[PDB]
C-alpha cells in the first residue's frame, strides 16, 4: 500500500559516495552502556 | 631537506599559524627549486582531511595537525598555486573542495566565477553565483547579486530567466537594497520587455522601498510614468502617494499634484488639492505652503475663494491652537 514510499525508494539511485565505512559524526564518550536487546543483537 | 620538513610537520607547534607557515615554507622551498608537482602534492598532504570534517579551527584542545586542514592560508595558497601551475579542472576541484569545507567567502565565490568567466564558461559562472547566493543569506547575497545581475544582463540570457533572477532577489531584499534592485528590474523591463510591466514593477517598488527612499521612489515612478504615458495616467500615482506618505512628504506631493493639475488647467481640482493640504498643514510651520496657495488664489480665483481660503486658514490655526503644537512651533522657530 506504501506506493509513494516504494516509488521514492525505487526512483532514488544508489549514492555514488560510499557510506558503509562511516562512523557517527559525533563520537560518544564511552564506555558504552547498552541493554539485553544489544546482547541479543550482538 | 625533504625529511627535515617531514619532521617539522611532525612537530606539534603551538599554533595553527605556525604549522601553516611551516607547510607554506615547504611549498616555497620546492617552488624555489622548482618541483611544481611535488609542491602540489605537499599542499595536498597538508590539506588532507575527511570528506565531512567540521573540526573547529580555533579549538585549543585538539592538535594543530588535526585542525590546520581548515586553515584558510593553506587553501588560498593551494588554489592559487594550482591555478597558476595546473589546469582549469584541477583548479575547479580545489575550489569545490573549499566550498565543501565551508571556509568559502564571497570573495572566493567571485574569484571562482571570474576564473570560469575568463575561461569563457559563462553558464558555469552563473551556476557558481547561484551556489554562493544560497550559501549566503541576504545582506551578503546583495554583494553577490550586484555582480551576478550585472553579469547576467550583460550576457543577455533569456528574458524569462532574467525575470526569474530579479524576482529571486526581490523575494527577500531588505528595503535598503530593494531600491536598487527594483530600479534595475524596471530598467531591464523597459529595455527588453513592456513599459506597462515596468510601471507595475515601479508600483511594487514604491510599496516596498524604505521610508527614507519612498518619496524618491514615488517621484521616480511619476517621472517615468509621465515620460512613457500621460499626465492623466500620472494622476492616480499622485493620489496613492498623498494617501500613503508621511506628513511632510504628503505636503510636498500635494503641492506637486496641485501644480500639475493647474498646468493641465483643472483649477477646481487644484483648489481641492490645496484644501486637503491646508487641512494637513499648520500655518506657523508651513508659511511657504500658505504663500503658494495665496499665489494660486491670486492667479486663479476671486475674493470669495480668497475669503474662503482665509476662513480655512484661521480654522486650521484654531485646530492647531494646542499646547503640543505650541511646543513644536516654538522649537522650530528658535531652531530656525
Amino acid at each position: 500500500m506504501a506506493s509513494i514510499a516504494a516509488g521514492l525508494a525505487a526512483a532514488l539511485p544508489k549514492p555514488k559516495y560510499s557510506s558503509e565505512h562511516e562512523e557517527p559524526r559525533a563520537t560518544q564518550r564511552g564506555p558504552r552502556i547498552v541493554s539485553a536487546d544489544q546482547i541479543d543483537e550482538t | 631537506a625533504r625529511i627535515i620538513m617531514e619532521k617539522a610537520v611532525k612537530v606539534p607547534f603551538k599554533s595553527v599559524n605556525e604549522l601553516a607557515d611551516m607547510w607554506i615554507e615547504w611549498a616555497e622551498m620546492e617552488l624555489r627549486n622548482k618541483n611544481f608537482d611535488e609542491a602540489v602534492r605537499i599542499m595536498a598532504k597538508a590539506t588532507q582531511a575527511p570528506k565531512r570534517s567540521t573540526v573547529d579551527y580555533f579549538d585549543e584542545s585538539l592538535s594543530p595537525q588535526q585542525r590546520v586542514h581548515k586553515s584558510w592560508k593553506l587553501w588560498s595558497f593551494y588554489v592559487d598555486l594550482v591555478e597558476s601551475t595546473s589546469s582549469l579542472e584541477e583548479t575547479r576541484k580545489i575550489y569545490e573542495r573549499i566550498f565543501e569545507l565551508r571556509i568559502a567567502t564571497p570573495q572566493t565565490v567571485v574569484n571562482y566565477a571570474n576564473l570560469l568567466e575568463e575561461h569563457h564558461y559563462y553558464e558555469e559562472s552563473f551556476k557558481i553565483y547561484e551556489r554562493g547566493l544560497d550559501l549566503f543569506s541576504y545582506p551578503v547575497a546583495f554583494e553577490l547579486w550586484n555582480l551576478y545581475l550585472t553579469k547576467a544582463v550583460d550576457r543577455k540570457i533569456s528574458i524569462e530567466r532574467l525575470r526569474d533572477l530579479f524576482e529571486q532577489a526581490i523575494t527577500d531584499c531588505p528595503p535598503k537594497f530593494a531600491k536598487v534592485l527594483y530600479l534595475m528590474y524596471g530598467n531591464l523591463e523597459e529595455e527588453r520587455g513592456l513599459a506597462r510591466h515596468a510601471m507595475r514593477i515601479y508600483e511594487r517598488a514604491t510599496r516596498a522601498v524604505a521610508d527614507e527612499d519612498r518619496a524618491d521612489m514615488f517621484n521616480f515612478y511619476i517621472t517615468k510614468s509621465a515620460s512613457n504615458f500621460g499626465l492623466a495616467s500620472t494622476r492616480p500615482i499622485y493620489e496613492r502617494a498623498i494617501a500613503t506618505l508621511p506628513d511632510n512628504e504628503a505636503r510636498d506631493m500635494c503641492l506637486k499634484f496641485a501644480d500639475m493639475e493647474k498646468r493641465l488647467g483643472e483649477i477646481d481640482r487644484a483648489r481641492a488639492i490645496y484644501g486637503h493640504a491646508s487641512q494637513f498643514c499648520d500655518p506657523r510651520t508651513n508659511p511657504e505652503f500658505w504663500a503658494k496657495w495665496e499665489q494660486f488664489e491670486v492667479q486663479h480665483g476671486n475674493e470669495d475663494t480668497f475669503k474662503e481660503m482665509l476662513r480655512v486658514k484661521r480654522s486650521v490655526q484654531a485646530k492647531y491652537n494646542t499646547d503640543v503644537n505650541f511646543i513644536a512651533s516654538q522649537a522650530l522657530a528658535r531652531s530656525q
Binding site: S19, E22 | E123, K127, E160, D164
Partner: protein
C-alpha cells in the same frame, strides 16, 4: 517516541537534522524515508509534505548526491499537487540553476514561469501584456500545440468593451498569432484563417485597423496571391477608407513600379480627399519620372 506522539513534519525534520549532526548519512536517509512512509500510510499519498521532500533533496545536495537530489525533486513534483508543491518547484528551480545543465535550467524556468503566468491569467483573464509575455514564453519554449492552444484561449478572451483602445492590443494579439504561424509553424492556411477570423471579429462599421490590413496585405504578397491581396484591400477601401491605408498601398504600388493601377488609386484618394498634398506631389513626381509632362 517523539515521532510516535507528534508525527508532524516538524518533528521528523528535527530528527533528520539531529542525525545529520550526530549520526550517519544512512540514518538521515532512513529518517527521511520513514517520515515519507509514515505520513503516506496515515494521511494519504497526496498529503506528504513538500517540506520533507525539500529537506531530503537539500540533504543529498549537501552530500553531493546531485542525481539523488534531482530524483527526489522530480519525484515530489510528479507525485504532489501543484498547489502544495509550489515551494518544491521553487527549490527545484534554484537547484537546477546551481547544478543542472543549461537545457535543464531553461526547462525548469519555463515550467516555473508558465505556472506563474497561468496564475496571473487565472486572476485576470484580460491582462493583455501578461498574455503577450506568456505568448513569448511559449514561443521560446517551442511547443507548437501548446502555443496554438495559448493563442486560442487568448482569442477566446474577447474584450466585452467595444473601445478601440483595448481593441488595439486585442487585434495586435491576432497579429502575433499570425506572425507565429507564418514564421515558426509555417502554416499558411492557418495564417489565412487567422486573418479571416480577425476580419470577422473586428467591428469594421465603427473602426478598422490598418495594422492588420497592412500585415495580411504583405502576407499575401509574400505568398504570391496578387488578386486575393488586391481583392482584400479593395474590400477594406469599400468598407472604410483610411489615410494610412491609402498611403501604404500607394507606397506598395510605387515599389511595384506599375502605373495604371496606382493612377486609379491616386484618383480614388483624390475622390476621397483632394487635399492630400503628399499624394498629389508623389503622383506628380511619378508622372515626371514617367516623362508624361503634359
Amino acid at each position: 517516541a517523539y515521532t510516535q506522539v507528534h508525527p508532524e513534519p516538524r518533528t521528523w525534520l528535527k530528527w533528520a537534522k539531529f542525525e545529520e549532526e550526530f549520526g550517519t548519512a544512512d540514518m538521515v536517509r532512513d529518517v527521511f524515508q520513514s517520515a515519507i512512509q509514515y505520513i503516506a500510510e496515515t494521511l494519504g499519498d497526496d498529503a506528504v509534505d513538500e517540506r520533507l521532500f525539500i529537506a531530503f533533496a537539500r540533504f543529498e545536495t549537501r552530500q553531493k548526491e546531485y542525481e539523488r537530489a534531482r530524483a527526489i525533486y522530480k519525484f515530489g513534483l510528479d507525485n504532489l499537487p501543484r498547489s502544495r508543491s509550489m515551494q518544491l518547484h521553487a527549490q527545484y528551480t534554484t537547484f537546477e540553476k546551481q547544478f543542472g545543465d543549461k537545457e535543464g535550467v531553461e526547462d525548469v524556468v519555463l515550467t516555473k514561469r508558465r505556472r506563474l503566468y497561468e496564475e496571473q491569467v487565472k486572476e485576470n483573464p484580460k491582462n493583455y501584456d501578461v498574455w503577450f509575455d506568456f505568448a513569448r514564453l511559449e514561443e521560446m519554449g517551442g511547443d507548437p500545440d501548446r502555443v496554438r492552444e495559448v493563442y486560442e484561449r487568448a482569442i477566446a478572451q474577447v474584450p466585452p468593451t467595444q473601445e478601440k483602445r483595448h481593441w488595439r492590443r486585442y487585434i495586435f494579439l491576432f497579429l502575433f498569432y499570425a506572425i507565429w504561424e507564418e514564421k515558426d509553424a509555417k502554416n499558411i492556411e492557418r495564417a489565412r484563417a487567422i486573418y479571416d477570423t480577425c476580419l470577422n471579429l473586428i467591428p469594421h462599421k465603427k473602426f478598422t485597423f490598418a495594422k492588420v490590413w497592412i500585415a495580411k496585405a504583405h502576407f499575401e504578397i509574400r505568398q504570391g496571391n496578387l488578386t486575393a491581396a488586391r481583392k482584400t484591400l479593395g474590400r477594406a477601401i469599400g468598407m472604410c477608407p483610411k489615410d494610412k491605408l491609402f498611403r501604404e498601398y500607394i507606397a506598395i504600388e510605387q515599389k511595384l513600379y506599375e502605373f495604371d493601377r496606382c493612377r486609379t488609386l491616386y484618383e480614388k484618394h483624390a475622390l476621397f480627399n483632394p487635399a492630400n498634398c503628399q499624394t498629389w506631389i508623389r503622383w506628380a513626381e511619378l508622372e515626371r519620372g514617367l516623362d508624361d509632362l503634359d
